[PDB]
RNA sequence: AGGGGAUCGAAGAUGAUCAGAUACCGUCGUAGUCUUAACCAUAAACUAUGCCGACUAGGGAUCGGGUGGUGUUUUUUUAAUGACCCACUCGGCACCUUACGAGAAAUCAAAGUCUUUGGGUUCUGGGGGGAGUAUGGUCGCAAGGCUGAAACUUAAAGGAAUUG
RNA sequence: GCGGUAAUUCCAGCUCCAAUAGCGUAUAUUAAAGUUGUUGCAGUUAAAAAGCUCGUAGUUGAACUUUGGGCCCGGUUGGCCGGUCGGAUUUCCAACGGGGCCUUUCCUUCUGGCUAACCUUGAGUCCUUGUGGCUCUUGGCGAACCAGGACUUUUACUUUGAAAAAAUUAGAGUGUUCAAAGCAGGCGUAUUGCUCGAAUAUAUUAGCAUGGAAUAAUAGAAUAGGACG
RNA sequence: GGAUAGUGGCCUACCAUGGUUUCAACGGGUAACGGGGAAUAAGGGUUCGAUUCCGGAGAGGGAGCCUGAGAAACGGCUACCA
């Protein structure tokens, strides 16, 4: 305070921040690649869903949405980019 | 709504100062905040500014020392005749030694006695001292 | 603040906030000057000689005086971390 | 304006003092006479093909520009061969160091050499008395129509 | 920036404010609504002369306590009747009714002397000659 | 901020800075330009399309993969509904509002709330109507919306 | 204009009180209070404080949303849930302490960033009374709403704080 | 505000003040008045935020599109010398401005007329060991503008300039004895005439004419009815 | 077309339905001739200009006209009104 770095925040600082205040402004949500071992290929998901997003072939499920991330069901896996 | 971008970034440079600090960050950022923030820089006013670069329509960081006391906007861009850049100066700087009036020319965005050199004249923007 | 020919003319001319280099005044009484005493070789503080600092009553009020002090008493060279620039 | 009939009067229209002799059989019926106003107007093809009459045209007709020369976009062509344009421009009061919005309407005649609709800026330009109010004459159409049939219908 | 509208085109508008707020101006309502031509005694001129009715004797105001010596004259120019003070000790003495009488202000712009009500005008002249004078002995009453 | 209320809601999308890539992200133009037309076809709004192929898909912003927002290309596929589906959903809005104010006249409530939708298309229209994307004299009526919308 | 009319209850009538007592207090109780259809458009309709945007300073609560956790409590077999706890973040209703700053003060995170006087815009005021009166227009079934003067009078009226 | 019995205020005497051939008074207007507020007002409680929202006119309205760098030309002040018989210009130097080039860069455009300018060079050289210097025709600059054709997105701002009555005003020169004025006057051979004057400025809003291209608008190519040939 | 010195709804015929307006039309008031200018002096302003120069209008009020290069003249005529 009265003299310090705008240009070069820390990182956790910056973190805590909202997604419209960080120092050049970006989205605080991902993307994952989604199993259910019954198949063998992967569906691509966004971390927010708002549609329920079906698998490939398989009328199965995969998340559900919610205020926000999605409820991802039951029995998954999934890694993040 | 957002009405002058200048003037946005002049007072949060005033109030920095007046609250004692160092930095700044302004936004939006323009073509015209930059020739501004450069001429107050080329005068002493303030220290060095820093574009950053959102994709958007950008963020300034300036650095300032105390040297400055104000620098305000003149918020209708006025028509200044050549003549009566005498009577603006006379109206708000602190005197006839220091200050500059900054306005807005054909020739260029510049403070008054590089105006009155150059010998042209235009639109008043605002003001260092 | 010279005149026509050199000649220094009008008194007095003020110290200065190391923390904001705005002016200290008179009546600001409520301003300080820290002295900062340079030591040598083992111990042994150096009896009048200082590596100074003056700050502006308005500074303090704010409270900003420690962390001001900080910032300028290690980055001229007698506190190694403490400080930070970044926040 | 005019369009169709131009023979359409009581009396018979035709350019003064244009004799064309039926004995010396031609190919045109009407013998044509024009000019170029000045100024740099082009005098248009359609004055030169056209086969209307208006005497009160600047370019086939027994006026003749000089004077003021003015711009102004066009607000009624509800008047037969005659239109009123709304010249706007700001006024400066010198106390309160602004300026406000003003407007002035000058009605004006227009040549079936010109197909001038709402909206087209027109140059118009001085000519001598022609009517209680009209003291000008249409003489470039620096317009169009303003995208017109770019407003069609759906794919 | 509160009220007034800074734009630069805001001409027009800063202007009519003006011309509608100046109406709340007591001297300017005045001058415009021809307040002085229309009601008040005088044309609007600065003196205007007339002739005595009666001779009166009007109690001041609190806390004073007196008879302050007045004359009801009827304007010549108009017949507008008004009530005139006569200045100075005595002088009512040099009056008399049906006699000619020059009015003037009491200078306060309208407005009653100090404790005359509703006098709004002094005596300056009779017959011609000055109210002042004949206090003097500067000079004389005329014949009739 | 907020048109028709008091609202003040900073919310919206914190689009990246990365206006290419993903890298991580394989397919194609070709890929998702197809794949925007068959749900154009069966009938969805750019809109719902972009949400679909957000999540179900990698399509982070269709606009990057394909440097063609997604209106557009619609409208070149010959796909773009006859108004603005913005303007559309105002006025199935004002319609459904309309429909309840007539069998409940005594709604004071819903009577301001069709006000202003209807505030809301009325400035929208006009809008569109200034840049040609609507027919210079287009006008929206209660007595004509509820054919227009369906 | 219908319906309804329990309750409380302008008007009225009373018992008392009083020098008087057209009242306060007690009783009786008409309209009304409730509802439908249509009017009326006013309240100290109050935060006596226009709206949009930027900036300026600390603190613990809380309401809604979200994010993070080898947090608690729920047992079953761990979970899943849900409620709870802690940190953070938007956006609410407020309180707290400060006051760089403002104010005639009382007080004010706006009433701040104003003689170092300009972000955009709307509206109202210009001593007091006369007076929200007269008049004309207009709206209304009416009651009244909106618009809204002058002559004349007048040296104060007024505000916040102080001591009595 | 004084005056109801010792009136600092009335009626006078004395004395004293202010302005003075002039001084009071009445009315009006102007300054004071930031109490009409563009500059520059005030609205919680002193006068003043419409009960509330919508909303036309009106005023207002985010950011972004040739920037940066390199070369040449010649000006006007100022320094350190002055060479010179108070002012002079060359080289040294900074400083502040103007113009024109090349950087991928319309300058409206063809069709000649015109050329002032160097990529030239044709000779060589006044002279400091030579790019210090200009005369100088035979291959090779466009724009500096004539004039004819063919065409041109609209504006605001600002610069300089024309066209412009006098008296008034600001202001130069001149000792109307001074001055307000006036535009006179001043010199000698005062016997036969000599001569300086009768400036300058302001003159704006509009129209005109020109330079500028920041600021703020306008128009352009999306059903290609696009642009060049 | 007529009329004029001549353009022009200037007037007449025929035909049409236009013209102006919150950027304030139209109407009302002016104890209103306009201008150069005058008064007040930080600046921005405020107020004034019947009146020595320029323009315009009039000759008790209206209209008409003769002469003439030029008047709708008034120290010209004609009529009505006062
Ligand atoms: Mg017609
Ligand atoms: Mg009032
Ligand atoms: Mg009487
Ligand atoms: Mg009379
Ligand atoms: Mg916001
Ligand atoms: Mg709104
Ligand atoms: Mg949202
Ligand atoms: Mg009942
Ligand atoms: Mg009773
Ligand atoms: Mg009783
Ligand atoms: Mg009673
Ligand atoms: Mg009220
Ligand atoms: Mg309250
Ligand atoms: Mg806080
Ligand atoms: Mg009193
Ligand atoms: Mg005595
Ligand atoms: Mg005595
Ligand atoms: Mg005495
Ligand atoms: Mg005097
Ligand atoms: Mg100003
Ligand atoms: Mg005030
Ligand atoms: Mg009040
Ligand atoms: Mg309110
Ligand atoms: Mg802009
Ligand atoms: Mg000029
Ligand atoms: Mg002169
Ligand atoms: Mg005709
Ligand atoms: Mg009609
Ligand atoms: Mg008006
Ligand atoms: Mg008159
Ligand atoms: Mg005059
Ligand atoms: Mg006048
Ligand atoms: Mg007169
Ligand atoms: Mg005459
Ligand atoms: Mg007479
Ligand atoms: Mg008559
Ligand atoms: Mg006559
Ligand atoms: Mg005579
Ligand atoms: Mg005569
Ligand atoms: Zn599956």
Redesign the pocket.
């Known amino acids: ?1 009265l003299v310090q770095d705008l240009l070069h925040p820390t990182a956790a600082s910056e973190a ?3 997604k419209l ?1 960080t120092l050049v402004q970006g989205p605080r949500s991902y993307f994952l690649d989604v199993k259910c071992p019954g198949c063998l290929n992967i569906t691509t998901v966004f971390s927010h869903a708002q549609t329920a997003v079906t698998c490939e072939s398989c009328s199965t499920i995969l998340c559900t949405p ?4 999605a ?1 991802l069901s039951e029995g998954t896996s999934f890694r993040r980019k | ?8 970034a002049l ?2 440079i ?3 100062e ?2 004692g ?1 160092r930095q700044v960050l302004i ?6 905040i930059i ?1 501004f923030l450069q001429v107050m820089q080329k005068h002493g006013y303030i220290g060095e500014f820093e574009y950053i670069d959102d994709h ?3 963020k300034i960081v300036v650095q300032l020392n105390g040297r400055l ?2 620098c ?12 009566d850049i005498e ?1 603006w100066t006379a ?2 700087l ?1 005197a006839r030694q220091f200050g500059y009036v900054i306005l ?6 510049m403070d008054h006695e ?1 105006a009155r ?7 008043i923007l605002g003001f260092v001292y | 603040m010279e005149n026509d020919k050199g000649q220094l003319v009008e008194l007095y001319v003020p110290r200065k906030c190391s923390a904001t280099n705005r002016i200290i005044k008179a009546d600001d009484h409520a301003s300080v000057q820290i002295n900062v005493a340079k030591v040598d070789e083992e111990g042994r503080a150096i009896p009048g000689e200082y590596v100074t600092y003056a700050l502006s009553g ?1 500074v303090r ?2 409270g900003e005086s420690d962390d001001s002090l900080n910032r300028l008493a290690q980055n001229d060279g007698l506190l190694k971390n403490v400080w930070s620039y970044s926040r | 304006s005019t369009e169709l009939t131009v023979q359409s009067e ?2 018979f229209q035709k350019q003064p003092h244009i004799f064309n002799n039926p004995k010396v059989k031609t190919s045109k019926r009407t013998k044509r006479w024009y000019k170029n106003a000045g100024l ?1 107007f ?1 005098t248009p093809k359609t004055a030169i093909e056209g086969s209307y009459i208006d005497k009160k045209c600047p370019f086939t007709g027994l006026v003749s520009i000089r004077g ?1 020369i003015l ?1 102004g976009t066009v ?2 062509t ?3 061969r005659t239109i ?1 344009i709304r010249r ?5 009061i ?12 000058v ?1 004006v005649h227009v040549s079936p050499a010109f197909r001038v609709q709402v909206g087209d ?1 027109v140059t118009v330009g001085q000519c ?6 009209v003291r000008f004459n249409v003489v470039k159409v ?1 317009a169009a129509a ?2 017109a ?2 407003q ?4 | ?10 001409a ?3 202007r009519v ?2 011309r509608n ?11 415009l ?8 005694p ?1 044309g ?4 205007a002369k007339g002739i005595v009715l009666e001779k009166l004797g009007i109690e ?2 609190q ?4 008879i302050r010596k007045c004359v009801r004259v009827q304007l010549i120019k108009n017949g507008k009747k008004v009530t005139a003070f006569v200045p ?2 005595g002088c009512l003495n040099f009056v008399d009714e049906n006699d000619e009488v020059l009015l ?9 002397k ?2 005359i ?2 006098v ?1 005008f ?1 005596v ?1 002249k009779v017959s011609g000659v000055s109210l002042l004078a004949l206090w003097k002995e500067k000079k004389e009453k005329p014949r009739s | ?4 209320s ?6 919206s999308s914190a689009i990246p800075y990365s206006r290419n890539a993903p890298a991580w992200f394989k397919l194609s133009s070709e890929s998702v330009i197809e794949q925007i037309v068959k749900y154009a076809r069966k009938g969805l709004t750019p809109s719902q399309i972009g949400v679909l192929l957000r999540d179900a898909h990698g399509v982070t912003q269709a606009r990057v993969i394909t440097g063609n927002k997604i209106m557009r290309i619609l ?2 596929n010959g796909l773009a509904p006859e108004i603005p589906e913005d303007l559309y959903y105002l006025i199935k809005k004002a319609v459904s509002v309309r429909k309840h104010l007539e069998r409940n ?2 709604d004071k409530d819903a009577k ?1 709330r069709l ?2 939708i209807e ?2 298309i ?2 929208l229209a ?1 809008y569109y109507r200034t840049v040609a994307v609507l027919p210079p004299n287009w006008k929206y009526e209660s007595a004509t919306a509820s054919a227009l919308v369906n």
């Open positions: 305070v805590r921040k909202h205040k919610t205020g926000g991330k409820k | 709504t957002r009405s002058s971008v200048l003037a946005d007072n949060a005033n109030n920095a007046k609250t600090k936004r939006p950022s323009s073509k015209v020739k958007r329509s950008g006391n104000k305000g906007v003149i918020s209708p861009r006025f028509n200044v005749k050549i003549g009577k109206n708000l602190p807005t020319t054909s020739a260029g965005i590089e050199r150059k010998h042209v004249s235009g639109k | 308005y009020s704010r | 009581r009396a740099g082009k003021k711009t607000v009624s509800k008047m037969h009123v706007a421009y700001l006024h400066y010198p106390k309160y160091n602004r300026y406000e919005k003003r407007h002035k309407n009605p800026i001598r008395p022609i009517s209680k109010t620096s303003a995208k049939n770019k069609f219908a759906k794919f | 920036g509160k009220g007034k509208p800074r734009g630069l085109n805001s027009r508008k800063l404010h003006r707020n100046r109406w709340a101006e007591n001297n300017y309502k005045k001058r609504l021809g307040t002085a031509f229309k009601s008040s005088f609007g001129s600065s003196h001041s105001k806390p004073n306590s007196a100075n000790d003037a202000g009491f200078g306060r712009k309208g407005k009653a100090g404790d009500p509703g709004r002094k300056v | 901020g907020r048109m028709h008091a609202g003040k809601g900073i919310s409208k070149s006249r005594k301001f006000i202003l505030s809301r009325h400035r006009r």
